[PDB]
Amino acid sequence: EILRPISSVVFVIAMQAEALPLVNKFGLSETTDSPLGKGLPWVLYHGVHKDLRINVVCPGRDAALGIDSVGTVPASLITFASIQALKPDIIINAGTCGGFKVKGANIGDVFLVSDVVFHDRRIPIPMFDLYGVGLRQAFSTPNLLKELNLKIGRLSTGDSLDMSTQDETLIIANDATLKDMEGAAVAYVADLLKIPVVFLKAVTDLVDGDKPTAEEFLQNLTVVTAALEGTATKVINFINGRNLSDL
Amino acid sequence: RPISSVVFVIAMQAEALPLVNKFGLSETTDSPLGKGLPWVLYHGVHKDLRINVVCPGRDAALGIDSVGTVPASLITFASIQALKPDIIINAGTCGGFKVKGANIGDVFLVSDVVFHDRRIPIPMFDLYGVGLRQAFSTPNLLKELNLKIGRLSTGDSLDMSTQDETLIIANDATLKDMEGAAVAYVADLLKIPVVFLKAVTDLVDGDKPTAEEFLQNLTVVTAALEGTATKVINFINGRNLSDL
DSSP: OOOOOOOEEEEEOSSHHHHHHHHHHHTOEEOSSOSSOTTOOOEEEEEEOSSOEEEEEEOOBOTTTSSBOOSHHHHHHHHHHHHHHHOOSEEEEEEEEEEOGGGTOOTTOEEEEEEEEESSOOOOSTTHHHHHHOOEEOOOOHHHHHHHOOOEEEEEEOSOSSOOHHHHHHHHHTTOSEEESSHHHHHHHHHHTTOOEEEEEEEEEETTSOOOOHHHHHHHHHHHHHHHHHHHHHHHHHHTTOOGGGO | OOOOEEEEEOSOHHHHHHHHHHTTOEEOOSOTTOTTOOOEEEEEEOSSOEEEEEEOOBOTTTOSBOOSHHHHHHHHHHHHHHHOOSEEEEEEEEEEOGGGTOOTTOEEEEEEEEESSOOOOSTTTHHHHHTOEEOOOOHHHHHHHTOEEEEEEEOSOSSOOHHHHHHHHHTTOSEEESSHHHHHHHHHHTTOOEEEEEEEEEETTSSSOHHHHHHHHHHHHHHHHHHHHHHHHHHHTTOOSTTO
16 A cells, blocks of 8 residues: 555557657656667567556567567567656557457447457467466456447457458467557566556558558558557557556 | 676476576576466576576466476566576477477577467468577577587477478477467567577487477487587676677
8 A cells, every 4th residue: 555546657559650649748758868678679668648657669670680579579678677666657559450350340439448369479388378378357447348338348459450261260269359569568567567557559440451552551551550549549648647557 | 798697598407407406596586577377496606797687476276387488588687687697598398300300419509489379360460470589699509519400390389280290390390389489579579699408308300209309308408508608708707798
């Protein structure tokens, strides 16, 4: 004890383009010293909204190839470094991802994740199977679900962007509404270091749906990311002034 | 200047203990890498060398070794930042391809390493998923110790799916594991030389269920890895990295 209102939050956002609209919305500033470590491509944005200190961290540009460092491994590293450096009350994993129409997802929905699994850590023996799947619960946010009326679902994570039949088999068996490339690894780290974790997952495509029309994916990313920033804004405002138990 | 500090990244307790005892390393009690994690760290000094062996520990929920890429990558990062080693050695058991010349008991050096389960069908993201990285070059060690060498392919599953095989075959891997490529990824971020000792416990092309063979060979093959790790430690002592 004694429990009190949430003071600081970190967002773990894999794609630096998914983070920018949140950074502008809040007048967050790219830190020029290097909190998380010297000589890393990781990007940190810092600011204060009202009663909330806000951190947004991105794994940044891959040195070899010039792209965002996607996947479970860079996401887990940055979750770990930013927790020890920054000491957040709560972690929010925000990002765009895939969705299943048969599970009720629609392009541009922003989901609040109920719980998360992996689909690509297959260790087919007793007790290593469960560990491989790595089922973790997102921190419970009944009031915020009531105010925002966001759709809810299980998220299933793997480091592959396509979907093999092996992935599909397990994503089906496990009832996932969503498929991304980071979340369950963020959930792992958060669990190790006992920090509440929330997920805001914006659906850009329907794994089990039709390919987008000409104009559709032309607009699609921009429109779905704006939808994601808009929901992230409302989460922050809601959180502001509240205790973890009041969430 | 001479190499003064080496860190072993070892995924499983059972792989680690033989080396712990051989060098009389002591279990770290102060949790330097972070309050409250399951990570295990043994410390010592051999001659000129500081020795540290870091393991991801028993899963808090399930009570078994915290295997796979994420734990590996976490402990590699955290131990590099805490200890500032000159070099990292990833040591462990793995599967080998018999048609590639691997045999049960063999302790391979590793030339370079790729991922087989990170498939991103976007230009430039494809090469990133694969994550081809070169092991630090140790020609004299290879020569003197007379070690087998080959490419290692990494992914988070113990079994092999069809598209797993496809990439393992395309990347001409001799060896299949669950950590190496991730360790290399991190060592690269932090510019630390990494080498790999990979001891073959099971033949992926062979006539046996993987985990039945894996577990049937483990006690003996882990003695074999200690055998090589010892010699590797003795060789490194007093040398520069360019001497390796």
